[PDB]
Amino acid sequence: DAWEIPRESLRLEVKLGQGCFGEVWMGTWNGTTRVAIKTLKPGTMSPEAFLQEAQVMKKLRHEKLVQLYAVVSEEPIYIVTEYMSKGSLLDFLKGETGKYLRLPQLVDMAAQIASGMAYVERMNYVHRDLRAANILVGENLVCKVADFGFPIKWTAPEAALYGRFTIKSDVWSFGILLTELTTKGRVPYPGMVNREVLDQVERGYRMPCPPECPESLHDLMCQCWRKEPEERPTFEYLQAFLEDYFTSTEPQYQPGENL
Numbered sequence: 259d260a261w262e263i264p265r266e267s268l269r270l271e272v273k274l275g276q277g278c279f280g281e282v283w284m285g286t287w288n289g290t291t292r293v294a295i296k297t298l299k300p301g302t303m304s305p306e307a308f309l310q311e312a313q314v315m316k317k318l319r320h321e322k323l324v325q326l327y328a329v330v331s332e333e334p335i336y337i338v339t340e341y342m343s344k345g346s347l348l349d350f351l352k353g354e355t356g357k358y359l360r361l362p363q364l365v366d367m368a369a370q371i372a373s374g375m376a377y378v379e380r381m382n383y384v385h386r387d388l389r390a391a392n393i394l395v396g397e398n399l400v401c402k403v404a405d406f407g408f409p410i411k412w413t414a415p416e417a418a419l420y421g422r423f424t425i426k427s428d429v430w431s432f433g434i435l436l437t438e439l440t441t442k443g444r445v446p447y448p449g450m451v452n453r454e455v456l457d458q459v460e461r462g463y464r465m466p467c468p469p470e471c472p473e474s475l476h477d478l479m480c481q482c483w484r485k486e487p488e489e490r491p492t493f494e495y496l497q498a499f500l501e502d503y504f505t506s507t508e509p510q511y512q513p514g515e516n517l
């Protein structure tokens with residue numbers, strides 16, 4: 259058991275999520291420390307399929323990966339975790355302060371995610387659904403990699419077509435996630451339906467450079483979007499590249515209207 263707790267500890271205060279097969283609540287733990295809860299909506303998935311997520315989350319422990327705190331085996335099940343106060347990043351980028359973000363805050367932000375995924379990469383694990391809807395945000399623009407568990411527009415074409423879901427198909431996704439950041443949360447492949455994406459991309463189409471995104475950064479995304487998984491960069495290299503960007507790659511970056 260080890261991470262099992264009682265319902266006596268917890269209190270589910272305001273419903274923040276409304277998942278495929280569950281819900282998500284702000285709360286309080288042992289009446290003191292403020293946490294988040296995944297509640298299985300009963301019948302649907304059962305304590306087998308749902309509770310392999312707590313297995314996986316037990317082994318990972320990293321400063322950019324949402325931290326498991328506790329579990330509740332006896333039904334209804336509450337999977338418990340730290341609370342990211344600004345929520346999902348897609349929400350944050352679309353919300354109040356999205357308009358004030360410039361490219362040093364987005365690229366800093368990006369480097370934290372790459373950090374988390376490098377740790378994921380080190381453990382020989384695949385995420386499978388890397389994107390702005392699976393990144394939570396707390397104060398001071400701290401981002402962490404989360405999971406809320408199909409998206410053609412984020413999934414690599416070798417994983418979408420043939421199921422080769424490797425670390426390097428998360429590398430692909432990271433490049434797309436980068437375009438979300440640089441457009442402020444806009445959906446990939448504007449106007450193009452799932453079917454058009456595959457076909458065009460399959461035939462070499464990549465997203466053009468976002469307006470006011472320098473070309474150096476657009477060369478990074480295309481690096482993630484190479485046709486051969488093994489020629490994609492790595493999260494470590496991407497981490498460093500993003501960390502060093504304004505000294506080593508854009509020292510004449512000058513902020514403008516949007517970025």
Ligand SMILES: Cc1ccc(C(=O)Nc2ccc(CN3CCN(C)CC3)c(C(F)(F)F)c2)cc1C#Cc1cnc2cccnn12
Pocket residue numbers: 274275282283294295296311314315318323324337338339340341342343344345346383384385386394403404405406407
């Ligand atoms: C309550 C809660 C419960 C569970 C999870 C969760 O499922 N996390 C998770 C699951 C799996 C994986 C890794 N696998 C990927 C798949 N892969 C195939 C295998 C490995 C990881 C990761 F950390 F590794 F990324 C995280 C997140 C939250 C949240 C929250 C929260 C906190 N503040 C707010 C504010 C607004 C909204 N939500 N929220």
